[PDB]
């Protein structure tokens, strides 16, 4: 079982207010046909418009919450809502647009999905809390058939144009009018009691219900993210490389070694308490310090309470030496800490919107992270940028412009003139540092940390 069989049963109770008299016994095959689609027994890579929960999790970057509400067999106007916050009104003749015929609405839909998804995914997954109008509106903006490739490139076709009779991916679909071979999943099929708002509001106080289609579409995708990434966590699942993942990760390791190495040199802590990933390795293996590890998995729901991580009886006295919380999200860090906390508010292709203020950070694996809280860092300060090196000044070998910086903490800078080697390493480190900060990571340190203490490690 790789795909969802079209012969799987579909619970239709959620659909019977918009579709009165709908059979209780219904398959995906019969539902697809009822929606106005003919699959014709085609095995060309598109076996079902509906997908499994596991396949949906593998394609989280493609999720677009979708909801349709009736406004007025005589067709009436529909409010189409998307988790992008867009509301389009289609007439059959937060951003909400006036009523226009489907021929122009479908151009808008293709533009919106293409701009939203071109840098995230090779497809779209419509996430539903299916009541009827959304499934029956799909025929007006969706075309299906064999799996195809783009006319302008090698990516899979996600759009279709009736003007040119051609296919395109999200990058080459300017002016296209039809969504081609989309995927969809109905959250209501997962076994739930009560309406969408009641289930969403159990875990999220951030998304309100301003009684608009996009509000429901947003709540839908949010509840789906909570079920698949907050309550259930799967760190085995791999995700494709779509950006700067490798550079961001390489930067993180360089910044960690640099910042921890300098803390141990400036304040000579006898012991370091490394709290976080159970698979963590010594980030400064040559350091003199007594390195003690504590296992805590990435918290995906609420940030850890320091009272449960530290107290209840390890040195036991965590007040001795320094605490290293490298991506270990706690509610209030102790004053003797070195902290890297991901800022969930960051705008990027790796960071997807999440549940209750949190975000879904997708870099090789999916990590639902709790909402960034400035109050977690009251006992600390923002760690300033600095580069430190004790390596010999020796070129061994891009051209050269002389480096003048107060933050290049090297023997050559102490001696009044930065050597070529330390200037190259400084600029490479600053690049890695800016790369990590812009990816969303934030660095915090114990208030007594001072890089002035690093000059005397040169004599």
Q: Closest distance between Zn ion and the C-beta of residue 227, in Å?
A: 12
- Tell which one of 204, 248, 403, 454 touches Zn ion (CB under 5 A): 204
In three-state secondary structure terms, 54 is helix
Quote the crossing angle between the two packed helices 420-438 and 245-267, to the nearest 10°. Answer: 110
Question: In 145-274, which ranges are continuous DSSP H helix?
Answer: 196-200, 213-225, 245-267
Alpha helices, H only, 79-211: 102-117, 133-137, 196-200
Contact flag: residue 95 with Zn ion (CB under 5 A): no
For the question of residue 316 being annotated catalytic, the response is no
* Residue 67 annotated among the catalytic residues of the structure: yes
Binding-residue pattern over the window 394 to 433 for Zn ion, x denoting contact by CB under 5 A: ----------------x-x------x--x-----------
End-to-end distance of the chain based on CA atoms, in angstroms?
A: 67
Closest by CA position to 4, among listed 35, 32, 25, 34:
32
Q: How far is the CB of 83 from Zn ion (least distance, A)?
A: 10
To ligand K1S, the closest distance from the beta carbon of 91 in angstroms equals 11
Shortest spacing between CB 41 and ligand K1S, in angstroms: 23
| CA pair distance 250, 387, nearest whole angstrom | 16
Local structure of 206: helix, strand or coil? coil
**Is there a catalytic annotation at residue 211?**
yes
Q: Rule CB under 5 A: say whether 152 interacts with Zn ion.
A: yes
Q: How far is the CB of 204 from Zn ion (least distance, A)?
A: 3
Neighbours of 286 (CB within 10 A): 7
CA 270 – CA 304 distance, rounded (Å): 26
| Residue with smaller CB distance to ligand K1S, 49 or 60 | 49
Between strands 142-143 and 125-128, the pairing is unpaired
Q: Is 323 annotated as a binding residue?
A: no
Answer yes or no: is 200 a known binding residue: yes
What are the residues binding ligand K1S (CB under 6 A)?
Answer: 18-19, 34, 73, 75-76, 78, 132-133, 136-137
One-character DSSP codes across 385-428: P-EE--S--------------TTEESHHHHTTS--HHHHHHHHH
| Active-site position among 59, 134, 226, 227 | 134
Determine if residue 308 is labeled as part of a ligand binding site: no
Interacting residues with Zn ion between 378 and 397 (CB under 5 A): 393
**Which residues have a catalytic role annotated?**
67, 69, 134, 211, 216
Residues of this chain that bind Zn ion (CB under 5 A): 150, 152-153, 155, 169, 171-172, 204, 207, 222, 393, 410, 412, 419, 422
Annotated binding site for S-adenosyl-L-methionine: 274-280
Annotated binding site for Mg(2+): 67, 69, 134, 211, 216
């Amino acid at each position: 079982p790789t795909h969802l069989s079209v012969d799987t049963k579909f619970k239709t109770e959620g659909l019977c207010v918009d579709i009165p008299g709908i059979p209780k016994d219904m398959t995906y095959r019969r539902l697809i046909s009822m929606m106005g689609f003919k699959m014709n027994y085609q095995v060309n890579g598109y076996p079902n418009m509906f997908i499994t929960r596991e396949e949906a999790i593998r394609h989280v970057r493609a999720w677009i919450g979708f909801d349709v509400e009736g406004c007025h067999g005589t067709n009436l106007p529909l409010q189409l809502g998307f988790s992008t916050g867009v509301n389009l009104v289609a007439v059959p003749t937060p951003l909400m647009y006036k009523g226009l015929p489907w021929n122009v609405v479908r151009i808008k839909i293709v533009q919106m999905l293409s701009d939203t998804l071109k840098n995230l995914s090779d497809r779209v997954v419509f996430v539903l809390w299916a009541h009827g109008f959304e499934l029956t509106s799909m025929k007006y903006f969706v075309k299906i058939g064999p799996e195809r490739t783009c006319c302008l490139c090698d990516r899979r076709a996600t759009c279709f144009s009736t003007a040119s009779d051609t296919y395109a991916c999200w990058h080459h679909s300017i002016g296209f009018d039809y969504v081609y071979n989309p995927f969809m999943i109905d959250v209501q099929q997962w076994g739930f009691t009560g309406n969408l708002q009641s289930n969403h509001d159990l875990y999220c106080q951030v998304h309100g219900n301003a009684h608009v289609a996009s509000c429901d579409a947003i709540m839908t995708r949010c509840l789906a993210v909570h079920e698949c990434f907050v309550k259930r966590v799967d760190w085995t699942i791999e995700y494709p490389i779509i950006g700067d993942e490798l550079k961001i990760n390489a930067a993180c390791r360089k910044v960690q070694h640099m910042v921890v190495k300098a803390a141990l040199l400036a304040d000579k802590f006898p012991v370091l308490h490394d709290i976080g990933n159970p698979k963590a390795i010594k980030c400064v293996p040559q350091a003199d310090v007594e390195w003690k590890f504590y296992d805590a998995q990435p918290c995906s729901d609420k940030a850890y309470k320091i009272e449960e991580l530290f107290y209840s009886y390890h040195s036991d006295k965590f007040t001795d030496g320094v605490c290293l919380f490298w991506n270990c999200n706690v509610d209030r860090y102790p004053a003797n800490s070195i902290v890297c906390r991901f800022d969930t508010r960051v705008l990027s292709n790796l960071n997807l919107p999440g549940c209750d203020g949190g975000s879904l950070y997708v870099n090789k694996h999916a990590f639902h992270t709790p909402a960034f809280d400035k109050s977690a860092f009251v006992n600390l300060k923002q760690l300033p940028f600095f580069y430190y090196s004790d390596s010999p000044c020796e070129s061994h070998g891009i051209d050269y412009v002389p480096l003048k910086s107060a933050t290049c903490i090297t023997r050559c800078n102490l001696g009044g003139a930065v050597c070529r080697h330390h200037a190259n390493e400084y600029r490479l480190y600053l690049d890695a540092y800016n790369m990590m900060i812009s990816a969303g990571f934030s660095l915090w340190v114990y208030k007594q940390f001072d890089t002035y203490n690093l000059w005397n490690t040169f004599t």
